[PDB]
Structure 1
Amino acid sequence: KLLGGGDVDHTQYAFGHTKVFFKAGLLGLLEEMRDDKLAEIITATQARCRGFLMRVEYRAMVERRESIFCIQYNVRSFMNVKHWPWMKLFFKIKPLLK
């Protein structure tokens, strides 16, 4: 199952009842070259992703922009108010209403 991942030659090895078999040193050489070739291929494919990844973060950060404020200010009110006679009054009273 493990070997499932990796940008590795799925050739170069071979499994059996007690162990896996693996090449080096030619096929070993091959792979290596290959390895570099994915950093390229990979390294480049990573980037965009990375890039792109944050590019979605900005779209969220931004959306959020106001919903925070709303939350921001909104709380502050209360902290000030909750101690105000008039507001406590409204409070006990707010229920008798319809």
Structure 2
Amino acid sequence: KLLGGGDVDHTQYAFGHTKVFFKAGLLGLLEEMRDDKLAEIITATQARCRGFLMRVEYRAMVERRESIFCIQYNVRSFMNVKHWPWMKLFFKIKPLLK
């Protein structure tokens, strides 16, 4: 599973019942070239992702836009009100209602 990642030559090695087999120094050379080739392949595939990743963040940030405000202002009210005679009154009284 580990070797899943890395911009490494997935050739140069080989697994078996008790251990992995690995090249150096040719196969070692191969891989290296390979390694660079994924940064390319990879580096480029990373980017879009990265890009894209934040692109979804904006869609969320934006949605959120108002729900906050609502929350924002809404609290403030209370902080002001909760100390107001009339509002306490309404409060004790709010229950007797139907």
TM norm. shorter chain > 0.5? yes
Q: State the identity %.
A: 100
Q: Deviations over 1:18-72 (max 9, x none)?
A: 5432111111111111110110111011001100100110010000000000000
Q: Deviations over 1:58-94 (max 9, x none)?
A: 0100000000000000000000000000000000000
Q: TM-score when scaled to structure 2? A: 0.89
Question: Cα offset for 1:4?
Answer: 3.8
Query: How many residue pairs are counted as aligned between the two chains?
Result: 98
**Distance verdict in 2 for CA 1:10–1:42, change over 3 Å:** closer
Q: TM-score when scaled to structure 1? A: 0.89
Alpha carbons 2:7, 2:38 under 8 Å: kept: yes
Question: Cα offset for 1:6?
Answer: 3.3
Can you give the 5+ residue segments of structure 2 that lack an aligned partner in the other structure?
none
The alignment's C-alpha RMSD in Å is 1.6
- The answer to whether 1:6 aligns with 2:25 is no
Can you give the 5+ residue segments of structure 1 that lack an aligned partner in the other structure?
none
**Distance verdict in 2 for CA 1:51–1:16, change over 3 Å:** closer
| Distance in 2 between residues matched to 1:40 and 1:14, nearest whole Å | 24
